[PDB]
């Protein structure tokens, strides 16, 4: 879902 560096 979310990229490794997301959030």
């Amino acid at each position: 879902a979310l990229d490794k560096w997301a959030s």
Partner: antibody, heavy 132, light 108 residues
Amino acid sequence: RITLKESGPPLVKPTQTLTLTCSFSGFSLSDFGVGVGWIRQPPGKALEWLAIIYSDDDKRYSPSLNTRLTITKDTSKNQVVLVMTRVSPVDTATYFCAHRRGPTTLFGVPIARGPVNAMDVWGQGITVTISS
Amino acid sequence: ALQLTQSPSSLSASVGDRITITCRASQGVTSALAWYRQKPGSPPQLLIYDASSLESGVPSRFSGSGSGTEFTLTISTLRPEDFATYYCQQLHFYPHTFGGGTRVDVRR
């Protein structure tokens, strides 16, 4: 200076397995948060993302090709290998590997993640034709 | 999955023009978006990373703005080497999608 270069067979037959190697210099896959990804481009078509691997060894794959792809790294040889099984004619494309920066650090402390948002250096690309 | 739509798909222009290419995402991708220019026979080249940061060594006529679902690349003064195909790429969600590309060619 970062450079990457793809190598493997220019021709492959349907149902066969395709192994592509990305050899690079200028960075190490042991450097913090670095990534190396693979992108392909069928002739005349758009770029298509395939997979990426990071130095901490997390791996991610295109959901559409997940079952046929394996990506792996060989840190000491500065290479990243992508194995695609059961190829068919639609897999004919130019295949590129590319570098992805990890976050900027200050005294080994991550302070900027903006640089990870791009694949910043690309290899020339290797043309692969799938035909029996 | 997430959709990235570029507009226009094709665009004609002349040396010296100002052009702007836009890329819209189906869900917000924050600022995780990159622009590339790809000349025939060559690999894509990074122009703008993180939606608006100018990549090192890239000429200042290139500019990127926007965040969320709408982004734009503008080349302020088109040079001959800019006749090419441009792509945007989202890096917020896996898979890291590319837009369909926009071809910029010599107007006549």
